[PDB]
Amino acid sequence: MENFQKVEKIGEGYGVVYKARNKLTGEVVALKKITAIREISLLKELNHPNIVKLLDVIHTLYLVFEFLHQDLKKFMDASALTGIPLPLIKSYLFQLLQGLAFCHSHRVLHRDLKPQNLLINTEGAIKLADFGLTLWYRAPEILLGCKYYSTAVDIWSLGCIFAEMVTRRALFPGDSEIDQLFRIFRTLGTPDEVVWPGVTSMPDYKPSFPKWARQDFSKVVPPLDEDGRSLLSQMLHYDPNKRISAKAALAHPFFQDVTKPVPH
Numbered sequence: 363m364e365n366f367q368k369v370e371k372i373g374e375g376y377g378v379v380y381k382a383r384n385k386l387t388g389e390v391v392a393l394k395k396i397t398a399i400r401e402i403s404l405l406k407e408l409n410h411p412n413i414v415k416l417l418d419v420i421h422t423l424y425l426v427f428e429f430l431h432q433d434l435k436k437f438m439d440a441s442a443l444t445g446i447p448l449p450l451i452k453s454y455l456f457q458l459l460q461g462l463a464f465c466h467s468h469r470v471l472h473r474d475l476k477p478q479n480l481l482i483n484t485e486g487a488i489k490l491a492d493f494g495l496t497l498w499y500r501a502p503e504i505l506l507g508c509k510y511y512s513t514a515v516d517i518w519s520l521g522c523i524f525a526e527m528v529t530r531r532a533l534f535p536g537d538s539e540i541d542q543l544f545r546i547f548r549t550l551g552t553p554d555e556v557v558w559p560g561v562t563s564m565p566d567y568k569p570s571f572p573k574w575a576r577q578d579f580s581k582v583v584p585p586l587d588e589d590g591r592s593l594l595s596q597m598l599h600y601d602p603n604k605r606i607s608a609k610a611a612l613a614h615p616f617f618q619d620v621t622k623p624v625p626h
């Protein structure tokens with residue numbers, strides 16, 4: 363639109379994302395060019411320090427967001443040789459659990475959490491961006507064809523991301539829906555009715571799924587301490603109803619010594 367001057371493409375998702383200058387405010391913004399109105403009103407009222415601000419909705423459908431240059435994916439890549447320091451891992455994890463708790467207590471699900479979608483600033487903040495309006499962070503209930511999923515899908519994604527900051531490798535780098543499912547099964551064991559009541563009734567569940575044994579989490583995320591492994595295990599419970607909430611995750615002993623370091 364004529365009050366916005368394009369600076370450069372930020373990325374491509376539903377649509378395309380540009381860095382743009384607002385000619386009216388002089389502000390630099392992220393401009394995303396693309397039932398929906400109620401969804402986008404819920405996003406425009408969601409205001410929290412760990413949620414990217416939806417500044418303006420222009421229907422002529424452009425969504426004007428606050429701009430941040432850096433994301434967690436870019437940061438993980440630049441940090442690959444040394445790793446993200448654990449204080450910063452813990453700070454990023456704690457802040458995303460806060461944004462998620464806010465979202466979830468306002469009946470908003472993210473649905474598509476990934477490192478790419480997590481924007482960081484120079485002061486040590488991290489913010490949920492690009493709400494769901496490639497498969498690595500997908501909860502197994504979504505992969506098993508469940509259409510009426512819960513807030514627990516965002517917890518699973520955040521658990522995957524937590525594991526990835528710790529080990530500097532994606533936890534479950536699936537390249538199709540079945541490879542994704544089977545990567546989850548080879549690590550955590552093939553779910554059954556014992557650990558996940560109702561799993562064998564999921565729309566895309568097949569009795570012919572191979573039966574893998576579970577690996578110990580001490581093998582999965584070394585050198586993470588017992589508090590970090592305890593919390594990760596609770597974020598990665600098969601049964602969405604056993605999966606810890608973002609609010610109860612905030613009171614976990616892992617966050618006892620949480621601080622907010624400056625990234626460098």
Ligand SMILES: O=C(O)c1ccc(F)cc1
Nearest residue numbers: 392427428429430491492
């Ligand atoms: O898609 C978003 O939500 C988004 C992406 C980049 C950015 F700087 C701000 C918002």
Ligand SMILES: O=C(O)c1ccc(F)cc1
Nearest residue numbers: 551557576598599600601
């Ligand atoms: O969902 C879990 O957390 C879980 C699944 C299988 C198992 F053997 C232990 C825990």
